[PDB]
Amino acid sequence: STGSATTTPIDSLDDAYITPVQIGTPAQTLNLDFDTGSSDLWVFSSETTASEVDGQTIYTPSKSTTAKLLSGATWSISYGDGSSSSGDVYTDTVSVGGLTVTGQAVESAKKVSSSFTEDSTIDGLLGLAFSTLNTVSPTQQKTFFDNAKASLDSPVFTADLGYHAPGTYNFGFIDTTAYTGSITYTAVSTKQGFWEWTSTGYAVGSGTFKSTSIDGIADTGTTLLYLPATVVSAYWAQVSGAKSSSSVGGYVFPCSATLPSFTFGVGSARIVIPGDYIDFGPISTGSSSCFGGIQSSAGIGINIFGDVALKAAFVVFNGATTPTLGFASK
Numbered sequence: 001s002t003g004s005a006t007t008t009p010i011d012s013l014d015d016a017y018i019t020p021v022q023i024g025t026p027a028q029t030l031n032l033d034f035d036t037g038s039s040d041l042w043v044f045s046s047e048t049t050a051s052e053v054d055g056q057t058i059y060t061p062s063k064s065t066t067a068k069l070l071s072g073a074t075w076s077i078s079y080g081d082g083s084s085s086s087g088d089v090y091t092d093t094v095s096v097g098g099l100t101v102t103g104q105a106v107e108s109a110k111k112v113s114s115s116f117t118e119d120s121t122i123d124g125l126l127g128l129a130f131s132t133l134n135t136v137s138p139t140q141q142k143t144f145f146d147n148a149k150a151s152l153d154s155p156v157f158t159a160d161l162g163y164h165a166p167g168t169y170n171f172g173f174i175d176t177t178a179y180t181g182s183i184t185y186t187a188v189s190t191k192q193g194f195w196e197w198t199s200t201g202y203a204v205g206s207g208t209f210k211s212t213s214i215d216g217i218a219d220t221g222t223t224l225l226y227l228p229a230t231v232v233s234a235y236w237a238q239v240s241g242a243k244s245s246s247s248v249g250g251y252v253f254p255c256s257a258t259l260p261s262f263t264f265g266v267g268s269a270r271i272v273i274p275g276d277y278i279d280f281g282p283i284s285t286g287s288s289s290c291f292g293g294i295q296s297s298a299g300i301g302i303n304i305f306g307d308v309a310l311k312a313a314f315v316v317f318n319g320a321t322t323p324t325l326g327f328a329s330k
């Protein structure tokens with residue numbers, strides 16, 4: 001079987017992408033943030049503390065004829081940005097763009113952090129990292145992808161994120177019309193539970209390509225590109241008036257500047273991020289200082305190829321027994 005769903009930016013900056021997902025019988029449609037950096041499928045629900053819900057669509061297990069409470073199971077998750085949520089666990093039928101999984105763990109939020117409450121457009125997350133990171137206790141649960149794998153024509157999913165525009169998540173097949181040239185595949189380490197790989201280097205604008213190994217994760221659930229301090233300093237040094245601001249928490253630049261592109265290596269191939277993708281607009285309404293889309297990973301502990309990088313490519317998540325990541329220009 002296969003599935004295909006359109007994913008849409010939540011705002012004018014592409015801060016995140018939501019994808020409609022059908023849960024329960026009859027279907028309850030929720031817009032979830034597909035996150036290859038985590039492994040929990042959790043939703044705002046009728047069980048979520050009322051004061052912590054602000055416009056989200058909620059899942060109501062009591063109205064689903066296929067929902068079953070998973071007795072004794074709980075979940076609690078903390079994201080690298082300080083966000084967190086927790087609750088209990090149902091199993092239910094979950095469908096993405098025609099692809100159906102029965103008995104998927106649906107984690108019902110009883111408590112959500114403030115960052116989630118304030119994001120009215122995101123009804124929950126759909127984790128797509130490896131199932132070893134799932135937080136359900138005492139019995140770990142599988143991701144939507146792991147549960148679908150056997151039924152898929154090919155054990156793959158692909159992310160085709162748009163720049164200020166809708167894109168596509170496909171499950172089970174590779175759309176050969178969606179990219180140009182060839183797909184370059186590169187090895188993945190699952191030892192930390194992430195889609196972790198090694199980039200072969202970078203270039204700034206029209207500069208010389210620097211061959212150097214950058215280990216990092218492919219994370220659709222992170223907005224920006226987080227890279228080592230040396231690389232990030234080399235990029236922003238090419239932007240007149242750019243500086244790191246401690247009060248803002250990253251590199252900022254004059255909104256009147258033009259940004260150079262950024263190239264990253266995948267094996268022998270190159271993915272080019274246009275400079276406009278790196279502009280995240282004024283730091284506050286009316287400001288002439290703009291926030292940069294390439295930031296240092298020094299405080300984080302791991303390099304993150306977030307949406308800024310991924311939306312410049314067609315990306316294959318190959319969940320074969322030896323997993324790989326594929327990148328193609330588009």
Ligand SMILES: NCc1ccc(C(F)(F)F)cc1
Nearest residue numbers: 037038079080219221222302
């Ligand atoms: N998008 C999920 C996610 C968020 C943060 C991290 C970090 F910070 F631990 F690298 C990994 C994955």
Ligand SMILES: NCc1ccc(C(F)(F)F)cc1
Nearest residue numbers: 035079083115116119221222
């Ligand atoms: N990386 C997972 C993640 C995704 C979105 C959010 C937000 F936007 F809701 F804060 C936090 C954490």
